[PDB]
Nucleic acid binder design. Structure first.
Length: 91
RNA sequence: UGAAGGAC
């Protein structure tokens, strides 16, 4: 998606970010959108390969919704396993 | 996170 082969804003940018912690080592930015889609129209995510990452939606209200209904609930990844996530406000 | 995105 609109690559540049160099450092910079990855692909979808944001406005209303929230952390996603407790994530399995299987997680990635690609799978975070494929699941927070429940909370709303997530458009960007980022991952730190260490059990933490971030995600954002087209509307800031869908974000606080993702850390009140999609916090402390199941999440899934391409590796074939699942774990809870502890969404946070941002950091 | 050696530098970005659909990676599988």
């Amino acid at each position: 998606m609109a690559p540049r082969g160099r450092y910079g804003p990855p692909s979808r940018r944001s406005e209303n970010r929230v952390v996603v912690s407790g994530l399995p080592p299987s997680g990635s930015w690609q799978d975070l959108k494929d699941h927070m889609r429940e909370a709303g129209d997530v458009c960007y995510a980022d991952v730190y390969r260490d059990g933490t990452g971030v995600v954002e939606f087209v509307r800031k209200e869908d974000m606080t919704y993702a850390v009140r209904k999609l916090d402390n609930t199941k999440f899934r990844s391409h590796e074939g396993e699942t774990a809870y996530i502890r969404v946070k406000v941002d950091g």
